Structure 1
Amino acid sequence: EVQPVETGGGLVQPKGSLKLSCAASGFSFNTNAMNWVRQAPGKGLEWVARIRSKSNNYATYYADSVKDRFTISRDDSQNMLYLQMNNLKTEDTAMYYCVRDQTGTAWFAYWGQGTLVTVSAAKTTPPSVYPLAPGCGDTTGSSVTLGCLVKGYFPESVTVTWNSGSLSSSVHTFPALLQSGLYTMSSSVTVPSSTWPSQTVTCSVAHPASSTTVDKKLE
Structure 2
Amino acid sequence: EVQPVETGGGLVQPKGSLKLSCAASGFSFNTNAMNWVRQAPGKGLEWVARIRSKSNNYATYYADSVKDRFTISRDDSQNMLYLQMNNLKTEDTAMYYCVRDQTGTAWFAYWGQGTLVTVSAAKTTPPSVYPLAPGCGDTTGSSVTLGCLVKGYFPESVTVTWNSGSLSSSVHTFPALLQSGLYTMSSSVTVPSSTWPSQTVTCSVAHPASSTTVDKKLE
How far apart are the structure 1 equivalents of 2:204 and 2:20?
36
Using the TM superposition, give the Cα deviation of residue 126 of structure 1 relative to its aligned residue in structure 2, in angstroms. 1.1
SS in 2 for 1:56: coil
Q: Distance in 1 between matches of 2:41 and 2:81?
A: 23
In the superposition, the TM-score normalised over structure 2's length comes to 0.91
Give how far 1:139 is off. 6.1
Greater shift, 182-191 or 75-84, is seen at 75-84
- Residue 10 of structure 1 deviates from its aligned partner by 1.0
The more displaced of 167-176 and 153-162 is 153-162
Moved more, 133-142 or 170-179: 133-142
Change (3 A) 1:138 1:215: closer
List per-residue Cα deviations over 1:168-219 (Å, max 9, x = no partner).
0211110122223322111100011212134422122122322212211222
Question: Against the structure 1 CA distance between its residues 137 and 62, is the aligned structure 2 distance closer, same or farther, given a 3 Å change threshold?
Answer: farther
Contact 2:36 2:50 in 1 (8 A): yes
Range with bigger deviation, 174-183 or 127-136? 174-183
**1:34 to 1:193, Cα distance in 2 relative to 1, 3 A:** same
Whole-Å separation in 2 of the counterparts to 1:3 and 1:211: 32
Unaligned runs of 5+ in 2: none
Distance 2:42 2:140 in 1: 36
* CA-to-aligned-CA distance 1:54-102 (integer Å, 9 cap, x gap): 2222212212211121111112333211111011111211121111112
8 Å Cα contact 2:158/2:206 also seen in 1: yes
Residues 102, 110 of structure 2: 8 Å contact kept? no
**In the TM superposition, what whole-angstrom CA distance separates every residue of 1:128-182 from its partner, at most 9, and x where no partner exists?**
0111111158963221111100011122332222222322021111012222332
Q: Distance in 2 between matches of 1:78 and 1:163?
A: 49
Q: Hey, what's the Cα distance between the residues in 2 that align with 1:30 and 1:164?
A: 55
Deviation at 1:27, TM superposition (A): 3.4
Deviates more, 1:131-140 or 1:24-33: 131-140
In the aligned structure 2, how far is the partner of 1:70 from the partner of 1:7?
Answer: 16
Question: What CA distance in whole angstroms lies between the structure 1 residues aligned with 2:186 and 2:81?
Answer: 40
What's the counterpart of residue 83 of structure 1? 83
C-alpha separation in 2, matches of 1:147 and 1:19 = 41
- Partner Cα separation in structure 2 for residue 22 and residue 211 of structure 1: 29
Number of residues of Structure 1 aligned to a counterpart in Structure 2 = 219
Q: 1:137 to 1:180 in 2, by over 3 A?
A: farther
User: 2:6 touches 2:23 (CA, 8 Å); kept in 1?
Assistant: yes
Partners of 2:96 and 2:208 in 1: how far apart? 25
2: CA distance between counterparts of 1:31 and 1:18?
Answer: 26
The answer as to whether partners of 2:134 and 2:146 remain within 8 angstroms in 1 is yes
How far apart are residue 34 of structure 1 and its match?
0.6
